[PDB]
Write a protein that binds this ligand. Structure first.
Ligand SMILES: CC(=O)N[C@@H]1[C@@H](O)[C@H](O)[C@@H](CO)O[C@H]1O
Ligand SMILES: CC(=O)N[C@@H]1[C@@H](O)[C@H](O)[C@@H](CO)O[C@H]1O
Ligand SMILES: CC(=O)N[C@@H]1[C@@H](O)[C@H](O)[C@@H](CO)O[C@H]1O
Ligand SMILES: CC(=O)N[C@@H]1[C@@H](O)[C@H](O)[C@@H](CO)O[C@H]1O
Ligand SMILES: CC(=O)N[C@@H]1[C@@H](O)[C@H](O)[C@@H](CO)O[C@H]1O
Ligand SMILES: CC(=O)N[C@@H]1[C@@H](O)[C@H](O)[C@@H](CO)O[C@H]1O
Ligand code: NA
Ligand code: NA
Ligand code: NA
Ligand code: NA
Ligand code: NA
Ligand code: NA
Length: 401
């Protein structure tokens, strides 16, 4: 499946891949390298609640390859600027980090978690991640010129920002390739339309185009509170399609190939409000779980994990409960226990990992969207050891492969 960057998952993982685990703890940054010999390693005495004053409410902490060597670096949008610790290649990182740009931050640029969105993305196919912010006047990009040299911001597009009415309480913004050229374009679920903007390849976009009169708060009644939406390749043409978890169930609009979109269809009467699904208590994802390399549906519900497998064309097979765990009825809580659907084995079929009450747990995908037994990986990065949502950040991320 293709690289999609979203508000919900700003650190994309690779398909295929062997994702590592990263924790921005109170004392700093810790990693669990995906390997046969499992352990927790502290790598930076920074980017933490008690290690530099990092706060979920004011700052953004991410992983992205900022150098082009295919290793992920630690990036923090802090109080006064953007701070980077680079991956040394051997499960260590530079410490202290370096401040590379006095912008995209609370006091330098006036950026706010409540109003603005900050991502890291290779926007020009350089192999390096540029800074991309949806701010006040539009989308601002700082070009990564290599060797920690970040160009001052340029207004990539005068849209998808606070001045054009975009709000985190009402709308969704994504980066994803909707044309097939390998460049990340902008997809925005606005007030009355899904808009797209095509990437020019040089740090700017074409003007936005309304492509679907649906999936929005003012078109079809789609709320952030009840109806999560994603973009993902549902068909295998490498272009992002639209999928929504609506009232009745799952709605899709398939990309025509060029970033225009087809009809809106209800393709599955499950995973919606009508079948009991709730943003407050459940996790719904789209990720490849089989050899077809298209988006399948995963849902951490009450009784456990439910999957519907894509037939290969954006329609789905029956819903099956594949694991009687990671669900609400086994004590998993959206506000305490992060759960991710990511490739941990390198075969292209996404696995399940969860940071539980006492242990990190995983289940291996057998390659066909069925799973093995719940495996206990390690008793760290968990609630019981002080890792809370309010004070810490945890990701699955490809640090190397
Ligand atoms: C939240 C934040 O920006 N924290 C930074 C910290 O990472 C850095 O070590 C320090 C250097 O003086 O400056 C603080 O502002
Ligand atoms: C929150 C926000 O968008 N702040 C930007 C700032 O990052 C940029 O340096 C400046 C340049 O004019 O424009 C502001 O609007
Ligand atoms: C929040 C939202 O949807 N804002 C859009 C804006 O992006 C678009 O450029 C404008 C002109 O069509 O229409 C507004 O409603
Ligand atoms: C939030 C939601 O599910 N909205 C759907 C909308 O997308 C669909 O177009 C309409 C008629 O089919 O039914 C609404 O309930
Ligand atoms: C919120 C939730 O878990 N809903 C599930 C639904 O997906 C499933 O189709 C049904 C039959 O197993 O069981 C419900 O409890
Ligand atoms: C939220 C959480 O961690 N729940 C786990 C559950 O998945 C596991 O089946 C059980 C028995 O080991 O232990 C619980 O603590
Ligand atoms: Na790198
Ligand atoms: Na490196
Ligand atoms: Na900040
Ligand atoms: Na594109
Ligand atoms: Na597609
Ligand atoms: Na896998």
């Amino acid at each position: 499946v293709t690289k999609v960057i979203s508000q919900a998952s700003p650190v994309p993982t690779s398909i295929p891949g062997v994702a590592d685990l990263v924790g921005f703890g109170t004392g700093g940054v810790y990693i669990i390298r995906n390997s046969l010999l499992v352990q927790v390693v502290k790598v930076i005495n920074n980017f933490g609640y008690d290690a530099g004053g990092w706060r979920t409410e004011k700052h953004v902490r991410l992983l992205a390859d900022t150098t082009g060597d295919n290793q992920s670096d630690v990036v923090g949008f802090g109080e006064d600027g953007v701070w980077i610790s680079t991956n040394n290649g051997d499960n260590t990182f530079t410490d202290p980090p370096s401040h590379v740009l006095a912008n995209f931050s609370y006091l330098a640029g006036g950026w706010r978690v409540e109003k603005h969105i900050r991502f890291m993305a290779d926007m020009r196919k350089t192999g390096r991640a540029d800074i991309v912010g949806f701010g006040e006047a539009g989308i601002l990009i700082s070009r990564n010129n290599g060797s920690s040299q970040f160009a001052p911001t340029q207004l990539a597009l005068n849209d998808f920002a606070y001045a054009q009415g975009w709000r985190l309480d009402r709308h969704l913004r994504f980066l994803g390739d909707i044309t097939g050229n390998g460049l990340l374009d902008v997809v925005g679920f606005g007030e009355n339309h899904v808009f797209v903007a095509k990437n020019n390849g040089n740090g700017t976009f074409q003007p936005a185009q309304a492509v679907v009169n649906n999936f929005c708060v003012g078109a079809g009644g789609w709320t952030i509170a009840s109806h999560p939406r994603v973009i993902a390749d549902l068909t295998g043409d490498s272009r992002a399609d639209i999928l929504g978890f609506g009232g009745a169930g799952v709605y899709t609009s398939l990309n025509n190939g060029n970033g225009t979109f087809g009809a809106v269809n209800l393709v599955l009467m499950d995973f919606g409000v009508a079948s009991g699904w709730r943003t407050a208590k459940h996790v719904r994802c789209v990720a490849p779980l089989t050899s077809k390399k298209v988006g399948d549906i995963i849902g951490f519900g009450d009784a456990g994990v439910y999957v519907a497998l894509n037939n290969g064309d954006g329609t789905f097979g029956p819903v099956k409960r594949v694991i009687n765990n990671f669900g609400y009825n086994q004590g998993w809580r959206v506000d305490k226990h992060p759960r991710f659907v990511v490739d941990l084995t390198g075969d292209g079929a996404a696995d399940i990992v969860g940071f539980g009450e006492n242990s990190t747990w995983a289940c291996m995908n057998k390659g066909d969207g069925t799973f093995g037994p719940d495996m206990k990986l390690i008793s760290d990065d968990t609630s019981s050891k002080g890792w809370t949502l309010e004070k810490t950040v945890r990701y699955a991320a490809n640090l190397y492969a």
